């Protein structure tokens, strides 16, 4: 069995035990969070009705807070002399799914 969980404006296909990187959540490492579900596929029958989805939720534990890859931005335009250096490291949380 597995389910599609919505978090941070995106959806991820997860089952029990999967580790998935997720947009930053205000939770301390080692805590537990409950997230909505966009679809449940248990064996063969597929749960897709809105109220059935509302009746279910996915519980996962926060592993650690991490950072994404370093992204270098150097905007540039020729015959202009315009440069603009900039960096960015997106913050992330690592979630281990406990059950559905």
């Amino acid at each position: 069995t597995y389910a599609i969980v919505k978090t941070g404006g995106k959806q991820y296909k997860v089952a029990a035990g999967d580790v998935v990187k997720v947009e930053k959540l205000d939770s301390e490492p080692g805590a537990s969070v409950s997230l909505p579900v966009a679809l449940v596929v248990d064996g063969a029958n597929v749960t897709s009705k809105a109220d059935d989805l509302a009746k279910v939720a996915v519980t996962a534990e926060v592993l650690e807070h991490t950072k994404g890859p370093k992204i270098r931005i150097h905007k540039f335009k020729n015959k202009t002399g315009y440069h603009k250096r900039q960096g960015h490291r997106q913050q992330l949380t690592v979630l281990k799914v406990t059950g559905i």
Binding site: I4, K6, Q11, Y12, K13, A38, L39, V41, A44, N45, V46, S48, K49, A50, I71, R72, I73, H74, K75, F76
Partner: protein, 124 residues
């Protein structure tokens, strides 16, 4: 006090040359050509980061269309039926279901067919 320009220039030269490893020809050896190629490469990376979402969405749409046509339904009618049925699964997980779990995609196709109106061309 007289100041020599060695260290200050060597710093940025080292960074630029290290960032240009793997390039072909003068673009990996000489600082000026490597700097030009760095400008071009970072501009290309910035543009491709924006375009990658559209590229992946196009690929997912292609896979979903292929899988739906394998179930005797067009992509647009399937999307309209899914929207009517209220299922909110996006195209990424739809393509994942199509590739990995054909039975789930068939069930979703069935519910989309159920949700569609009787006459799609009616002015309703």
């Amino acid at each position: 006090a007289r100041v020599k320009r060695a260290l200050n220039a060597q710093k940025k030269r080292r960074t630029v040359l290290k960032a240009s490893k793997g390039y072909r020809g003068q673009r990996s050896r000489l600082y000026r050509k490597a700097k030009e190629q760095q400008l071009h490469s970072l501009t290309y990376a910035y543009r491709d980061r924006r375009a990658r979402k559209g590229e992946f969405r196009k690929l997912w749409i292609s896979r979903i269309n292929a899988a739906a046509r394998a179930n005797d339904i067009t992509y647009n009618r399937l999307i309209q039926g899914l929207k009517a049925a209220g299922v909110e699964v996006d195209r990424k997980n739809l393509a994942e279901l199509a590739v990995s779990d054909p039975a789930a995609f068939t069930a979703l196709v069935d519910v989309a067919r159920a949700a569609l109106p009787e006459d799609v061309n009616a002015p309703s």
